[PDB]
């Protein structure tokens, strides 16, 4: 049990923080808590939409939440129905001026957290895990990625003996700083237990 | 080490006599990295040997060194089912290290109460050929000659 988290390893090199602001010693914690609660609510509500990243900004008494997603419509609604509904649920929790944006995920099959969740969904549907993993990777490479690696660990297929299955294509140079690699994790709850899913997408090096 | 023959550290010549050998001796005196202390002790000793016997301390020191240098030593080697004490010539680098080491150690087995004094006197005896330092050298040599018969096991 070894490998460093491929995102935290690239913060401020190939990858940027998800909560971008400044706060002083007396304040930092409380903002951070609210920040996570914002993610808590949205992670539940926006799941069906195809949630990939949740950026957060702050100045003074006002905050801007930018939601990246594969299905922008499922967020916005009919002419703004759910999009409006959100601000109210939002600024109730926030208790402050909570600007909610939405933005496209141009290629969900090049978004690692998306690929990960899809396979996790597939294996809660009792699909063939190995066949799935090869597929996921096949999708990501077709969509143009320079390399891909997907991993599933647990009681695979229901087996009593836990095992780890993975598949990979092209390059995935986890040791290279300047290599841009999107990473994502998805939890698959089954009747026999939890499976962990990890997706690595190598978009390219910078 | 395994790959290459390591590099002998070139020391910086001492401030008072301009001598790499003196510097080396100082460091051997030096406990806990207190080199100022170490420096004084030697130089204080250098003062003392001048008072007791009016000569060049440097000359005394260097003569004492050449007197404690073992020219031959025994190094064990287990050949077959027995450990033979094989007689070996000492490299000049090693002769120096052993000489300076024994000088300080024998010094610090002496009974007089101040280090500078012990360091002084031991350097005086070793210069004249007396003292535990030279005794060490004489012994090491005698062991080597005593086992001259095993000098063909030399590597």
């Amino acid at each position: 049990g070894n490998k460093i988290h491929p995102i935290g390893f690239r913060l401020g090199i190939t990858r940027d923080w998800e909560s971008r602001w400044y706060a002083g010693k007396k304040q930092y914690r409380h903002l951070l808590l609210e920040d996570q609660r914002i993610r808590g609510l949205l992670e539940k509500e926006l799941y069906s939409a195809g949630l990939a990243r949740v950026d957060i900004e702050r100045a003074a008494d006002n905050v801007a939440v930018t939601v990246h997603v594969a299905k922008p419509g499922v967020v916005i609604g009919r002419g703004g129905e759910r999009i409006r509904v959100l601000r109210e649920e939002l600024a109730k929790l926030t208790g402050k001026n909570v600007a909610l944006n939405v933005q496209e995920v141009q290629n969900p099959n090049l978004s690692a957290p998306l690929v990960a969740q899809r396979v996790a969904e597939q294996i809660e549907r009792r699909f063939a895990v190995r066949r799935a993993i090869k597929q996921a990777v096949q999708r990501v490479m077709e969509s143009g990625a320079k390399g891909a690696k997907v991993i599933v660990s647990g009681r695979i297929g229901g087996a009593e003996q836990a095992r780890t299955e993975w598949a990979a294509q092209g390059r995935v140079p986890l040791h290279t700083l300047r290599a841009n690699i999107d990473y994502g994790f998805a939890l698959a709850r089954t009747t026999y237990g939890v499976l962990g899913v990890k997706a690595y997408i190598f978009l390219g090096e910078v | 080490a395994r790959r290459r023959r390591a590099e002998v550290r070139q020391l910086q010549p001492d401030l008072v006599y301009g001598d790499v050998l003196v510097t080396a001796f100082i460091n051997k005196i030096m406990r806990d990295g207190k080199k100022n202390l170490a420096a004084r002790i030697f130089y204080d000793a250098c003062k003392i040997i001048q008072e007791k016997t009016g000569q060049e301390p440097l000359k005394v020191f260097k003569q004492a060194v050449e007197n404690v240098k073992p020219r031959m030593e025994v190094r064990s080697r287990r050949v077959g089912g027995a450990n033979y004490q094989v007689p070996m010539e000492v490299s000049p680098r090693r002769q120096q290290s052993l000489a300076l080491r024994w000088l300080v150690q024998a010094a610090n087995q002496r009974p007089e109460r101040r280090a500078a004094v012990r360091i002084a006197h031991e350097l005086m005896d070793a210069a004249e050929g007396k003292g535990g330092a030279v005794k060490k050298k004489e012994d090491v040599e005698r062991m080597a000659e005593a086992n001259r018969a095993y000098a063909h096991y030399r590597w």
Binding site: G8, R29, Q36 | -
Partner: protein, 60 residues
């Protein structure tokens, strides 16, 4: 004895000594950082995600 404890830690006590930090994320009573409100494990978990502003792997 856990959820009752993450709860009892919230309510103000009978005496101010009895107050102690719990990790607001996982409820951990030990190795809780004041600055974040988080324990050493959560501190690491969020930081690796990049969800701690300005925080990054420190190397020198």
């Amino acid at each position: 004895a856990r959820k009752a404890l993450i709860e009892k830690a919230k309510r103000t006590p009978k005496f101010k000594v009895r107050a102690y930090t719990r990790c607001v994320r996982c409820g951990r009573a030990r190795s809780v950082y004041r600055f974040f409100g988080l324990c050493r494990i959560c501190l690491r978990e969020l930081a690796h995600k990049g969800q701690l502003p300005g925080v990054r792997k420190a190397s020198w």
